[PDB]
Structures are given as structure tokens and as C-alpha cells.
Design a protein around this ligand. Sequence first.
Ligand SMILES: NC(=O)C1=CN([C@@H]2O[C@H](COP(=O)(O)OP(=O)(O)OC[C@H]3O[C@@H](n4cnc5c(N)ncnc54)[C@H](O)[C@@H]3O)[C@@H](O)[C@H]2O)C=CC1
Ligand SMILES: NC(=O)C1=CN([C@@H]2O[C@H](COP(=O)(O)OP(=O)(O)OC[C@H]3O[C@@H](n4cnc5c(N)ncnc54)[C@H](O)[C@@H]3O)[C@@H](O)[C@H]2O)C=CC1
Ligand SMILES: C[As](C)(=O)[O-]
Ligand SMILES: C[As](C)(=O)[O-]
Ligand SMILES: [Zn+2]
Ligand SMILES: [Zn+2]
Ligand SMILES: [Zn+2]
Ligand SMILES: [Zn+2]
Ligand SMILES: [Zn+2]
Ligand SMILES: [Zn+2]
Lengths: 207, 206
Amino acid sequence: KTIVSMAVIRRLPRYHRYLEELLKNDVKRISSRELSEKMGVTASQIRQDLNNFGGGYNVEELYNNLTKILGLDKTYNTIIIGAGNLGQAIANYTSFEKSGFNLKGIFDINPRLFGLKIRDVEVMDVETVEDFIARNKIDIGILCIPKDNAQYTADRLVRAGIKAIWNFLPIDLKVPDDVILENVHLSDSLFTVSYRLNEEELFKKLK
Amino acid sequence: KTIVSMAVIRRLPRYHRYLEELLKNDVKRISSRELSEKMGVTASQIRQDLNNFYGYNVEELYNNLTKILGLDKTYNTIIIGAGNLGQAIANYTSFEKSGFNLKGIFDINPRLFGLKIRDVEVMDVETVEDFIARNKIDIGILCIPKDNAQYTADRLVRAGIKAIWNFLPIDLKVPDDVILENVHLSDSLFTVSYRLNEEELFKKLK
Ligand SMILES: NC(=O)C1=CN([C@@H]2O[C@H](COP(=O)(O)OP(=O)(O)OC[C@H]3O[C@@H](n4cnc5c(N)ncnc54)[C@H](O)[C@@H]3O)[C@@H](O)[C@H]2O)C=CC1
Ligand SMILES: NC(=O)C1=CN([C@@H]2O[C@H](COP(=O)(O)OP(=O)(O)OC[C@H]3O[C@@H](n4cnc5c(N)ncnc54)[C@H](O)[C@@H]3O)[C@@H](O)[C@H]2O)C=CC1
Ligand SMILES: C[As](C)(=O)[O-]
Ligand SMILES: C[As](C)(=O)[O-]
Ligand SMILES: [Zn+2]
Ligand SMILES: [Zn+2]
Ligand SMILES: [Zn+2]
Ligand SMILES: [Zn+2]
Ligand SMILES: [Zn+2]
Ligand SMILES: [Zn+2]
């Protein structure tokens, strides 16, 4: 659990992106109202969210403060487990590196892939991962393996001292309560497309 | 824009995930207290979300959410970009089970044409507009590099695609009758750096 509610926490990266978009179009200031319009959050909720962290808005300053709030002024040592399609897609997303997420190694069970170069890292045998985590002070494990007996792999990361798991698998991983588990569900985005495709009808029906 | 507000709409799939899991777990009813916990939402907010459309019957609320989300219908999708991300999306069979039937995958790379993915073969993207019209495609999933991607999205739009599910970190322009949903994995990752750094943050704030 967290000092600030997850509901607020989950809005923070969206404010951050949107302020990045304004800072990059040289927009100097933004009102509570334009900001609320764009975010679909009430102006007063946005005030409240930001009030957790100190005292319209100067774009560059709010941006910089959100960068700080989000921990993006620090470095995280990451590894990726699973060098398949998803693992390589994530590995090649160099924008995460510019935000402080330093990819230190990538691990697979498939000898076909051992030695493959992605950016500056070589795919290594997952056999050595627990050693690697402790040798390299790894903070985050990104999990992109198939789901079968995945708990076992999770357990190996946890007992090697990982601090957080960014999990793409569609199961419930069990981790101790001190370990951060963030589960990705791309369906949550996809299902808003089906919603919007059918919303007009849906309402025809209800009335 | 939408009849219901986007904030409500974005919580619906998450309600549906949780109810789905209660079902698989053979749980039948669920107090609004014990529901509201997990949602980390207020029973009162859960109430007001559903209100746009003492406890809850699990299978009932679930079926209602399936219908609200349009998940009782079937959508034909294509994938543009047969690289790492497009293949990860192609092979994720849960979407299929939810009504998202993959009809075609497209690429520019002559070395991929005919490559078999699940039950689909990779085709030249030069044929994508004919495909769309021939096959009544609803949703195009963009998994290509960023340069001149706007052109590709235009092709999909001119050809009558209804929706685009965009993974590219750029702002596409589409007309007001096309749905555009942008994915940002950073919105999930940056909550991991927030949580790891939170104690430090609040020590430094005080
Ligand atoms: N969260 C979501 O919304 C989505 C989740 N996914 C999931 O992401 C995961 C990865 O997907 P893809 O890359 O398409 O699969 P893939 O088959 O391309 O890659 C999996 C890789 O993991 C390796 N692997 C298997 N067991 C391993 C182990 N114990 N340790 C290290 N490596 C191991 C395999 O050798 C393979 O290289 C799957 O679980 C998939 O279901 C995929 C798409 C969307
Ligand atoms: N939204 C997010 O959070 C994330 C976004 N991405 C993005 O998704 C995209 C795909 O990434 P990867 O699959 O790793 O890249 P990739 O380079 O592995 O694959 C791209 C594929 O697209 C093909 N291609 C290029 N232009 C095309 C066009 N006009 N039509 C059809 N095919 C075309 C190429 O031949 C190649 O097969 C990239 O833009 C990447 O930055 C990746 C990870 C996370
Ligand atoms: C990403 As979750 C904790 O709502 O399964
Ligand atoms: C997901 As968006 C329309 O705020 O870039
Ligand atoms: Zn071993
Ligand atoms: Zn889940
Ligand atoms: Zn669960
Ligand atoms: Zn964006
Ligand atoms: Zn934007
Ligand atoms: Zn049109």
C-alpha cells in the first residue's frame, strides 16, 4: 500500500504526459479549466491531487514538479525476463531509458536467443538471473514470459531481492507485501474502443 | 466525444476484470464494501458509474458490464506492423475470446509476406485498403515506427476503418467520426517509479 491513494497515483502520469505536450509546444501557462477539460477530471480534483505534494499553472514548473513526484529524477536498474516478441518490443522502447529506467540485462530460457544483441545488452540464460540481480542491484523485473508456472519465476526474482515487478502476464502473481507489483492489462484500453463503437446504440436502447 | 464521460468509461473494463475473476472463483454475490475495497473506488463512485446505464449479484453485474462495453458483439481487426509488438498483440488470444477476431496482418517487409501467424498470414500493406473494404474491418491496430505513420492512418481512414488502436507515441489526426485510442505503457511504468520513490519523496517534503 501507499501514502497517496492509487486513484490519484494513476492520474499523475497522465498530467505529466499532457504537460510534456504543452512544454514542447512552448505553451507558458495552463488554467485549471483547460487542464480539467483535457484530462476529464474536475478542476477541483486536480487541485486536490496536486495538493498532496506542496503548493492556473506554470507549465514548465508543474512539469518539473511532476517529474520529481513520479521519481523520474532517479535511476532504476531494470531487467526483462522473456526475450520474445513483447520483451523485445519493451527492450527497444528507448524512451523508457531516457526517463531513468536503465536496462541492465535480458533473460530467456531459449538457447536460440542466447547472445542476441538488443541495444547494448545481450540475452542471457535465465538460469543466472538471481545472481545477476544481486550483483547488479536490480530494482525492477519486467516479466514478459508465457503464463505457465510463472509464479515460480516471480518467486526467483523476489527471493533474489527484486523490489518491483512490472507484470504483463494475464494471471495473479503472488508477491510479498513489501514488493511492488504493477500488472499491465492492455484490454483495459482495447475495451474502451468496443465501448465507443457501441455507445450510440446502447443509449438508443436505454431510452 | 462521448455521451458518458471518459473517466467513467475508463473504469468499466477494470470493473469487468474484477467481476470476471469473482466468477471464475465461483463467487455469486459481493457486498458493495468488499467490492469497493478492491476497486479502491468508493462504493458511491461505483454506484454513480453504473447509474449512467445492498450488494451486487456477480454474474448479473458482469453480464451488464459485458453489454455496456460492447463485448457481446464481434469486431474484425487488422494489425499494421508485423514486428515485435504486432506479433505480441496477434498472439494474445484473449482478445479473440472477447470478440476481437483478427482477420489480417500487414507489413512493408517483403521478407515477411506469407509468414503464418496463428491462423493469419502476413500481407503487403499496399493491399490494406482493398482488404478493409472486402472484409468489413472495424479496428486497425497500429504497431509501426513513427515516421510517416500519419500517411498509413490516412489509408485506414479513407478506406472506412471505424477505429484505430494506436501504439505509436505520436498524435495522429483522424476525422471526428473515427475512434482513436492511444496506448501509453509509460502511464503504468511511471507508477512503479512513483511507488519505489514515495517514502523518499515524503521524507524530503516534510
Ligand atoms: N498484458 C497484456 O495486455 C498482454 C500480455 N501479453 C503477454 O506477454 C507475455 C509474452 O508474450 P509474447 O512475447 O507474445 O510471447 P513469446 O512467446 O514471443 O515470448 C515469450 C518468451 O519467453 C521465453 N520464456 C519462456 N519461459 C521462460 C522463463 N521461465 N524465463 C525466461 N524466459 C522464458 C520464451 O523462450 C520466449 O522467448 C505472454 O504471457 C502474453 O500472454 C501479450 C500481449 C498483451
Ligand atoms: N505505446 C507504447 O507504450 C509502446 C509503443 N511501442 C511502439 O510500437 C511500435 C512497434 O514497435 P516494435 O514492434 O518493437 O518495432 P519493430 O521495428 O519491431 O516493427 C515494426 C514493423 O513495422 C513494419 N513497418 C514499417 N512501416 C510500416 C507501414 N507503414 N506499414 C506496415 N508496416 C510497416 C516494419 O517492416 C516492421 O516489421 C513502435 O512505434 C514502438 O515505438 C513499443 C513499445 C511500447
Ligand atoms: C492492474 As490491477 C491491481 O487493477 O489487476
Ligand atoms: C490517451 As491520450 C488521447 O490522453 O494521448
Ligand atoms: Zn535452476
Ligand atoms: Zn489481471
Ligand atoms: Zn486478480
Ligand atoms: Zn500520446
Ligand atoms: Zn497527446
Ligand atoms: Zn469518414
